[PDB]
């Protein structure tokens, strides 16, 4: 077999705190003699299905729960079977995030949602509204600061604005998603995205701002506002840029509605170390001890483990996180989510540049994201 027996190889995203995870691995090694290697490869969410398909890859893959339906569907993931006693230690709704066609296909780790993070020193009073940002920008665009910088290359970051006034991915009803009912080219969708483009046609954010550019900018005090997740808080602490975490700005009347991710740990179907990986995840990572260790590197957000969550919930930033979360929506985990995300990332990039109108950018993504009813009936499958 391609995956080596008697070790654990874990893949987790670079923004997440692999050192703290690596530390939980150390404690595992020193107890069990089992070597644990933590890696953070680029384009993890893409690299994994590519190598796992060949029967290779990590024993354990971390990602938000939204990719996992596709992985499970492609046969890349083993069924997760926790004992009732363990299952009961985690919030039921986090288990729900990693249930797919009646089966658990990952361990939920922590609930993630974007918050508005602001420098009090530059803005003791953050705009609680999106519309008062072009005005507040040029106030600093001769100061000479930008008002707002956040990643513009990943639709995850722009999705709150585009969804605030009525955009949505797949319609949820009765416990099921209707893959034919997509809400990407509706009024509120085009609305939030035209607004976003009228921040770049108007020189108030640059079309090509990415995660790197935005994090530095905010952490070197050159912008007073940014949108980012709980993992970002560690590098802000070391920059000492005196910051607060708060409710995202409203667009028109509406709360800005981020897609909510549950960071999740899946077990590679081709791993000969499935029982090992369970041991490691249930008895080392998903413990007050384990999560704290990872959390101290990069904050996880609101952890699935009840006991530790109750400690973390006292934290005002976690309360902010969950306030944004309850205003947002849990991502679906269905296999069509990756196409949805590719279609929306394309539409947002092509409208911030100019190869398409907002209206035609979203017209195309809606088309590529929804299904054709009649051909699907002819084929006899909803795929």
């Amino acid at each position: 077999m391609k995956i080596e027996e008697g070790k654990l190889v874990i893949w987790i995203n670079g923004d997440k705190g692999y050192n703290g995870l690596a530390e939980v691995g150390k404690k595992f090694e020193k107890d069990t003699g089992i070597k644990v290697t933590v890696e953070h490869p680029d384009k993890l969410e893409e690299k994994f299905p590519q190598v796992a398909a060949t029967g290779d890859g990590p024993d354990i893959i971390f990602w938000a729960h939204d990719r996992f339906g596709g992985y499970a569907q492609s046969g890349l993931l083993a069924e997760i079977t926790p004992a009732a006693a363990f299952q009961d230690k985690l919030y039921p709704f986090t288990w729900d995030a990693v249930r797919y066609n009646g089966k658990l296909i990952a361990y939920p780790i922590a609930v993630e949602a974007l918050s508005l993070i602001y420098n009090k020193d530059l803005l003791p009073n953050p705009p609680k509204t999106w519309e008062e940002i072009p005005a507040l920008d040029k106030e600093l665009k001769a100061k000479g600061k930008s008002a707002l910088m956040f990643n513009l290359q990943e639709p995850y970051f722009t999705w709150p604005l585009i969804a605030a006034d009525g955009g949505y991915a797949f319609k949820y009803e009765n416990g099921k998603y209707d893959i034919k009912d997509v809400g990407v080219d509706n009024a509120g969708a085009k609305a939030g995205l035209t607004f976003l483009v009228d921040l770049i046609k108007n020189k108030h954010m640059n079309a090509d701002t990415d995660y790197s550019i935005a994090e530095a900018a905010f952490n070197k005090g050159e912008t007073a506002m940014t949108i980012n997740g709980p993992w970002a808080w560690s590098n802000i602490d070391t920059s000492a840029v005196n910051y607060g975490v708060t409710v995202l700005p409203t667009f028109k009347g509406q709360p800005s509605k981020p897609f909510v991710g549950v960071l999740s740990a899946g077990i590679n179907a081709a791993s000969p170390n499935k029982e090992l990986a369970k041991e490691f995840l249930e008895n080392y990572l998903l413990t007050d001890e384990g999560l704290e260790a990872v959390n101290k590197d990069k904050p996880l957000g609101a952890v699935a483990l009840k006991s530790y969550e109750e400690e973390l919930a006292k934290d005002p930033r976690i309360a902010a996180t969950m306030e944004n979360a309850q205003k947002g929506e849990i991502m679906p985990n269905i296999p069509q989510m990756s196409a949805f995300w590719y279609a929306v990332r394309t539409a947002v990039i092509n409208a911030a540049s100019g190869r398409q109108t907002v209206d035609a950018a979203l017209a195309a993504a809606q088309t590529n994201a929804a299904a054709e009813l009649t051909l699907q009936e002819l084929l006899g499958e909803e795929r």
């Binding site: 796992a52 060949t54 569907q73 296999p335 590529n368 084929l379 006899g380 795929r383």
Partner: protein
């Protein structure tokens, strides 16, 4: 007739049985263009393992031209990526013979023989948002 969605035939041979007609004799309209199906198209519909579609309780089917036309449209919009057969076998840990692969052009489920040809000729399979597609023998060189 057939306006109970929880109780009408899915497949042509069962539709023929419930009409007490035969497949040689049944008359069917394409669901897209509404034209009547040619006899060879009726046969093709069965061999291609397609499903009877119902509009307003009436049973339709599909003609060759429309099938190919609306398939290509669906494929364009939902093409994900491509793989050689060898990776597919690793991925699902089964012989290709066990995976559902339809012809990208005519939608006929590929035979093991057609799947093998893909392997022998190093022809990739295409993933259409979860659907696996290849090319059958009759669509393998052009008509």
């Amino acid at each position: 007739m057939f306006q109970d969605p929880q109780e009408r035939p899915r497949k042509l041979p069962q539709l023929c049985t419930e009409l007490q007609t035969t497949i040689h004799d049944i008359i069917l309209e394409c669901v897209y263009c509404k034209q009547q199906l040619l006899r060879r198209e009726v046969y093709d519909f069965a061999f291609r393992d397609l499903c009877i579609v119902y509009r307003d309780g009436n049973p339709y089917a599909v003609c060759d031209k429309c099938l190919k036309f609306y398939s290509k449209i669906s494929e364009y919009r939902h093409y994900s990526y491509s793989l050689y057969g060898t990776t597919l076998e690793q991925q699902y840990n089964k012989p290709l013979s066990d995976l559902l692969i339809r012809c990208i052009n005519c939608q006929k489920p590929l035979s093991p023989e057609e799947k093998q040809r893909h392997l022998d000729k190093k022809q990739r399979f295409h993933n259409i948002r979860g659907r696996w597609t290849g090319r059958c023998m009759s669509c393998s060189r052009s008509s």
